[PDB]
Design a binder for this molecule. Structure first.
Ligand SMILES: [Zn+2]
Ligand SMILES: [Zn+2]
Ligand SMILES: [Zn+2]
Ligand SMILES: [Zn+2]
Ligand SMILES: [Zn+2]
Ligand SMILES: [Zn+2]
Lengths: 267, 265, 267, 267, 265, 267
């Protein structure tokens, strides 16, 4: 469009017409979604109430869990293998409370999630098989996020959603009968410092806290004394943004903005 | 000696550092423009490249990868596409006056982040000894192409380390010199440009040389990308009151290390 | 909680009451600290002043130096090996002046610091042996930090401080009779663009400068022309923030804020 | 079996009864096989006549080709990408002469085949999908084999055939609907210094040479002047072993012998 | 001085090297038996281990991996299996008199071949300072388990390098000493044993302690493996005229480096 | 061919006529050679004698030393860095005695030589610059060789000699105006258990020994007691094979026999 007079107009036409970007009800049509978590519990803690709301509407929610949570205990007589047996059950129970379908366990070791083509391939296979309408994953640009598994899951999820659409990427998948990942599915990023879409989870907050504490191994009383205020405060930082008590924040952008975009901060 | 930080900084920039952004490319005879994929040089600084050629600067591309993955055409393999994209780029660069292209040949979506790639770029720096280097800004927020983050990091690193005789010393052992210490670094694809080039006059050219990457810009995909790319050129151009612009971030060499007030330029 | 009215109230309760956080005097009880540095001289440059005052208060200050500084010369006649043996001597004398106990050399090669589990296990074994009260390290989120040794030292430091506390992490340390790293120690990040604790070093500035120049292989006369003003200017950026002439800046935060936290900018 | 009197008897009962190992007609029942090659052309050069014989009998032969042959030319105006386009066509044409079904291209770069869990996963997916009755691959113990791609394909093929049977190995495959690789398929190793099964390829030798030269890019006249004597001599080393002019040799052992077996040299 | 190679070699072995295979474990108070998976120590040298315990030697296992992949039971995950296999191994080792087990915890089928693993074993060598080390022979032909090749290589390497103060120096920095220089290395699972232990008397014990790894030896799988394992014990036993034996390859430390006549022992 | 009667006849025709192979005088035309060594001293130990005779004939002999020898000391007071600077001095003087031109130091760390494309590119750039007539390197198939630096130097050497001849391999070398490595050069492997060419060094033995001992950091009196007999014994193992007192052994083969060849034991 050669004759438009200001950046601001252009950007506006770009968002609303060219890209028809819409934060009003961005999960309106979804039938199936994947929620990707670095560790068992992260989906519920980041977006449990949202997962529930989706379930409630008849959306199929599938988990993909990058690691086994092997490392997450201070108990010197609980091995990582035992912990991981336990966290699997804990996540199955938590997810059942949220109406969640199915979990894909990638089984990478807790704290050792690689950042590699290999991991992109695992996700790409799930993506291609399930062809979901939207994907959720932690925002790897969250500042002071000191857990490598979190930053890497984030990155790998965004990369995989783009690359799994390309037939020459992980090409054996197509050779065993899968199609590339279908275009026009959304990415939504939770655990974000810059959300631009909030789900009100005021009514659901006690459901979320319950489903979080089901991961008992992660949440004994002395830990919960700190974690419950923390989780509640986080939910209020998000909710206030839409004038409600408790929210879950997401960052959702048009696919182009994840690449060469110097004005991403205008959504 | 000096009283305030505000004063101390100013003196740093202008006296001690000589940092000056009015004409940062006025003394440039040879430059490298480093791109992660074929087409990134033209999309991100195609108009500036034209401007540099027309001025007589020699402009040399270094493309990190082969564009192998860039198609949804299931009847086009990566190898075929890679061979087409080197053609596309050769024609695209002629239009902008581009001399020479070094292809490193890493696979698209697979550019490593490692000492090996630093050694490939170092060997080129030491060979060509350019006056300035262009590369994507590795800090662009929400940049989710690893090839992009990786390129910018490795470019800035390599410009530094290629200067060190003990770094990839085999280069010296075979007759190369360490990379000269006077050169500039300019990052394109940047959210914090502190230097903008007006390409309002060149915009139609820029767009034609982009379109020359036909594998990347079929008809339906240009339906979003021409509007996208104009909208970005307006973003940079507005910063200096022109229609279309190209944004570059530039900084004294020092600021890339241990510097808490980099947002002051 | 659960009754608190607003996000602003929750946040302040969380910070001060639940998490017991305050930056009045965060090094108060410290008997032993590790100063983790990517290259010989980084401890002196970013926190040389603070080290001295810690020595002065009778705190045992220990260095961990991630790499050998192999690459840090433009002299064609000086091999990397020769340089490393020099820089070690330089560090030892620079550290004498700051009253510095003892230095662990990891001996990774300058410019080639891995970002790997192996390096966490190196840090972890040290933390488990020393059991420091506090650990200092570069902020790996510093804008525009382009030395991979710095960003990587920073992230590895934060990660090791968490993981060294887990008994299933690097479990052989335990099998050889080291204990998990003790829980309550602090983290302080230097070379930072968002400091929230400032140490006045104004009275110490000349000693700091002398202790840096002791790295003569790094600061001959021609480089010192650029670097002395630079170093003075950084120290004034930090000093200004609390109204003293010369300062050293540090970023400190509750432990929980290193993970999924979306309002880390409020401190 | 507690009361057997010599090693030699035991070993004999072990082979013939316990393991019912049979080198008489070891491909008798196969319906589908995979032939794994490091580069395009290796299946034909190592075992072209055998592939043909299998085709002839109605066996489905599927290729898996580890690399793209990107590196295999001395022509300074033929890029690796062009070479690889060309070698794909060359292999399609060669394979058509041998009755070959289908080729899986892993697309790893020629000379850069990794030795990694990732590559095991690609093979494991093909194995699980196709469930073939037997697999062929170069013998990685062939002495003085100086091509890394050859040694690694060999190893990876033997490992994958064992690991793809295990449900916890590459577990996402089972989560997208695949079953583990079925038990009791044979491995046969070509390019071997110790074959214990030879296929007579006297009648087929000229077919093989033709299908080898179809890879024109690899076989110009000046190269063929050396390669044709070489290939013929190799085929006679194998054939003489069964008193025929030209053979293809394989090493075939019972699955147990690929693990902890100190008497493998007795077959 | 000396006239023939045959003479020069002999003198090497016996005078200069003191290499002597009649009772190589006569002076051994503590030994490490390094296994790639839980059960390899008992399968490969279970009877010898028994013999060493009964003699008073302290026997310490170092297991490289967790056995995570070792089941076709689709209702048993790797983590569950790993937790069962550590139990299995604890019971199995008690029966043979085994003290202590170091678990390194790498995943089964994933043991890296790297400096990191050498540092884990080195830390144990330096801690425990054993008199001898047992490990699989990395040269077994047709050994196709990477965990197996990898273990033997890393064991022999680590025994060497743990002796070097500059190697994993942090160990020293925290109070450990380099690994003492007097110790032996013996490779089991070997096709070229030059020392055989008669375990004819212990064979039923060996087999019971193997069976204790019940996850690995259901009924139908033991239908092949008991015959397999007896057939291997006959292989080694025949070498010295006994019914069942365990084969070890042993060599002067020198022979592991630059030695063209290693087949002469 | 195609008419030849027996395998034994084919093989001898192949070796002698097609491949022009013979070990009468394989270094005849050599003007320039690389002696590739894994650690400082390996060239002198395995082929010190042969080097001298090459110098003596006026051949330019160049060393490539893969690593710095950092680890090679039991002295707790001598750092790896210090050792490397020493060993370089030792090499330089040891090489003066063998009339050795010039040494390329790659500077990988003793014990940590990668097995990677990066290292082939290091060798390749050297071969393309020097264009040697011959390359000497350790046999990576030596029985029981337990130093990973040796096996890896050996395989990397053979691989680089092939790949450096391909223009698409490390193509940037070409873009900077180096040529592919010239085709007809020979490969000779030392530290070998199957030598097929023997150099009489009997008259040179005392000089060899002096040139090794010049590595005093490696051979103090106590280690020399073990090592002098050892070195004498190896030289007699090789000498015996051609009826001289002291020899150096080398394995040489046609190029084709480095790949898929099943009768490499016939030479
Ligand atoms: Zn998590
Ligand atoms: Zn790009
Ligand atoms: Zn530094
Ligand atoms: Zn091949
Ligand atoms: Zn095992
Ligand atoms: Zn050596």
């Amino acid at each position: 469009f050669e004759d438009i007079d200001t950046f601001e107009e252009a950007f506006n036409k770009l968002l609303r017409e060219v890209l028809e970007f819409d934060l009003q009800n961005p999960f309106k049509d979804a039938k199936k979604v994947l929620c990707i978590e670095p560790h068992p519990d992260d989906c519920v803690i980041g977006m449990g109430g949202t997962i529930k709301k989706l379930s409630d509407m008849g959306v199929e929610v599938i988990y993909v869990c990058m690691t086994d949570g092997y490392m997450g205990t201070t108990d010197e007589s609980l091995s990582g293998h035992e912990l991981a047996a336990i966290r699997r059950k804990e996540e199955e129970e938590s997810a059942r409370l949220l109406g969640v379908k199915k979990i894909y366990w990638l089984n990478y070791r807790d704290t050792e999630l690689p950042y590699s083509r290999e991991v992109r391939k695992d996700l790409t296979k799930i993506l291609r098989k399930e062809q979901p309408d939207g994907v959720f994953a932690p925002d790897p640009w969250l500042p002071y996020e000191s857990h490598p598994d979190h930053r890497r899951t984030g990155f790998l999820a965004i990369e995989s959603v783009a690359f799994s659409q390309l037939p020459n990427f992980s090409n054996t998948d197509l050779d065993i009968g899968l199609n590339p990942y279908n275009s026009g599915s959304f990415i939504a990023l939770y655990y974000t410092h810059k959300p631009n879409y909030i789900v009100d989870i005021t009514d659901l907050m006690e459901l979320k806290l319950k489903a979080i504490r089901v991961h008992r191994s992660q949440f004994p009383d002395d830990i919960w004394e700190k974690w419950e205020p923390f989780l509640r405060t986080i939910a209020m930082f998000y909710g206030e943004k839409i004038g409600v008590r408790y929210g879950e924040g997401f960052r959702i952008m048009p696919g182009l903005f994840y690449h060469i975009t110097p004005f991403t901060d205008l959504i």
